[PDB]
Design an enzyme around this catalytic site. Structure first.
Site, short mmCIF file in Angstrom:
data_model
loop_
_atom_site.label_atom_id
_atom_site.label_comp_id
_atom_site.label_asym_id
_atom_site.label_seq_id
_atom_site.Cartn_x
_atom_site.Cartn_y
_atom_site.Cartn_z
N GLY A 26 0.61 -1.17 -0.02
CA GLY A 26 -0.05 0.13 -0.13
C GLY A 26 0.76 1.24 0.03
O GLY A 26 1.88 1.23 -0.47
N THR A 86 10.65 2.91 8.53
CA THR A 86 11.91 2.41 8.01
C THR A 86 12.82 3.69 7.77
O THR A 86 12.22 4.91 7.93
CB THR A 86 11.92 1.72 6.59
OG1 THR A 86 11.72 2.63 5.60
CG2 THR A 86 11.05 0.50 6.75
N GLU A 87 14.09 3.42 7.50
CA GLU A 87 15.26 4.74 7.13
C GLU A 87 14.57 5.39 5.64
O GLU A 87 13.64 4.30 4.98
CB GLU A 87 16.44 3.87 6.47
CG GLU A 87 17.20 5.00 5.90
CD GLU A 87 18.69 4.43 6.03
OE1 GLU A 87 18.74 3.25 6.51
OE2 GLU A 87 19.61 5.06 5.85
N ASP A 133 13.82 -11.20 -3.12
CA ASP A 133 13.41 -10.25 -4.28
C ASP A 133 14.53 -9.22 -4.50
O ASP A 133 13.88 -8.06 -4.67
CB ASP A 133 11.98 -9.57 -3.97
CG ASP A 133 11.25 -9.38 -5.18
OD1 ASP A 133 11.89 -9.36 -6.39
OD2 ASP A 133 9.94 -9.06 -5.04
N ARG A 137 14.39 -2.47 -8.35
CA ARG A 137 13.31 -1.85 -8.11
C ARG A 137 13.11 -1.84 -6.67
O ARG A 137 12.23 -1.19 -5.91
CB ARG A 137 11.98 -2.43 -8.67
CG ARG A 137 11.98 -3.98 -8.32
CD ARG A 137 10.37 -4.71 -8.73
NE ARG A 137 10.74 -5.98 -8.47
CZ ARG A 137 11.39 -7.07 -9.39
NH1 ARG A 137 11.86 -6.74 -10.43
NH2 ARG A 137 11.58 -8.22 -8.85
N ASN A 138 13.80 -2.76 -5.85
CA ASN A 138 13.88 -2.95 -4.51
C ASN A 138 15.24 -2.59 -3.96
O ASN A 138 15.96 -2.95 -2.68
CB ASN A 138 13.80 -4.46 -4.15
CG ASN A 138 12.30 -4.84 -4.23
OD1 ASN A 138 11.33 -3.98 -4.26
ND2 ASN A 138 12.01 -6.02 -4.58
N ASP A 151 13.51 -3.66 1.72
CA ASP A 151 12.53 -4.76 1.80
C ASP A 151 12.95 -6.18 1.57
O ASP A 151 12.30 -6.90 1.41
CB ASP A 151 11.18 -4.29 0.91
CG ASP A 151 10.73 -3.14 1.34
OD1 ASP A 151 10.48 -2.80 2.36
OD2 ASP A 151 10.77 -2.03 0.51
#
Ligand SMILES: Cc1c(NC(=O)c2ccc(C(C)(C)C)cc2)cccc1-c1ccnc2nc(-c3ccc(C(=O)N4CCOCC4)cc3)[nH]c12
Length: 271
Positions: A26, A86-87, A133, A137-138, A151
């Site tokens: 989300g 998170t940071e 993952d 993008r991560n 993540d």
């Protein structure tokens, strides 16, 4: 304080300042903790996460401290939606950052991004912790241009069937080794394969891996022993490193400690 564990942040200590976008769980917002400290706040959408399992793991994840890992500061559990604090990374996701041609990146900058990621992954590997993952993008970029891995491990708590199934629309097919696609054999060596694809994304300035293929065609290509090929900006020594991550035999792929030594050697060679 009272009614709060070590993994627990009081949401009353948060000031919400800007929307950052939407991820698998989300909306994520930029804010301040106790009016001073920058944070990113994930507002976990109902039905998106295996929340109780995540809360039990949050305790361990908060102890994963490395300068090249986007830190988990805590969780806000005594509510609905739950928050993950998170940071905050001012320059956003690495994939979009690579795609901005204004940066006119030098190859020394691209190698430094690979090294930042490799240091984070060596740290996770030293803790026997899989990202699951890993991809551009991560990864996120801070205001100093430092890339950090984000993540890590959260894929385990995603309730979305399109993401968890290997033939699903959201599964990371293009970052997966043959044994994951064929047998669901996940290991340190599937993170190594994904790291090689990430180096390819960095040197390709964010192109999609196997850009002319569908996910189904990519799985077939990889199964047949075929691979991505050298990005124009990668030297032969850099290409040798990312290629080494794609050995058909998982046990013949390097560790992140070995990849780190290879990247440092190339930095010394191409200084
Ligand atoms: C990480 C993040 C997610 N993803 C997720 O939660 C998420 C959850 C789960 C998963 C699994 C399970 C699939 C692995 C993956 C992912 C979604 C949204 C924001 C942030 C975010 C966090 C921490 N810091 C962040 N900083 C940003 C930012 C954004 C735009 C600009 C921006 O507007 N710019 C404009 C100018 O150019 C570039 C920056 C500047 C900064 N965004 C951040």
């Amino acid at each position: 304080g009272l009614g709060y564990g070590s993994w627990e942040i009081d949401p009353k200590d948060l000031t919400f300042l800007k929307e950052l976008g939407t991820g698998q769980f989300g909306v994520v917002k930029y804010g301040k903790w106790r009016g001073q400290y920058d944070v990113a706040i994930k507002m976990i959408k109902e039905g998106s996460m295996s929340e109780d399992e995540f809360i039990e793991e949050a305790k361990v994840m908060m102890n994963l401290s490395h300068e090249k890992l986007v830190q988990l500061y805590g969780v806000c559990t005594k509510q609905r939606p739950i928050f993950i604090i998170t940071e905050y990374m001012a320059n956003g996701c690495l994939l979009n950052y690579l795609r901005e041609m204004r940066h006119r990146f030098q190859t020394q900058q691209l190698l430094e991004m690979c090294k930042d990621v490799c240091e984070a992954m060596e740290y996770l590997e030293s803790k026997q912790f899989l990202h699951r993952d890993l991809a551009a993008r991560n990864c996120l970029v801070n205001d100093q241009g430092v890339v950090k891995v984000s993540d890590f491990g959260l894929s385990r708590y995603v309730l979305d069937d399109e993401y968890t199934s290997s033939v699903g629309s959201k599964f990371p097919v293009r970052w997966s080794p043959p044994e994951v696609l064929m047998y669901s054999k996940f290991s340190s060596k599937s993170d190594i394969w994904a790291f090689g694809v990430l180096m390819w994304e960095i040197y390709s300035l964010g192109k999609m891996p196997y850009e002319r293929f569908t996910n189904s065609e990519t799985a077939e290509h990889i199964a047949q022993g075929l691979r991505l090929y050298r990005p124009h900006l990668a030297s032969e020594k850099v290409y040798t490193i990312m290629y080494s991550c794609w050995h058909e035999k998982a046990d013949e792929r390097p560790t992140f400690k070995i990849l780190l030594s290879n990247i440092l050697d190339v930095m010394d060679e191409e200084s």
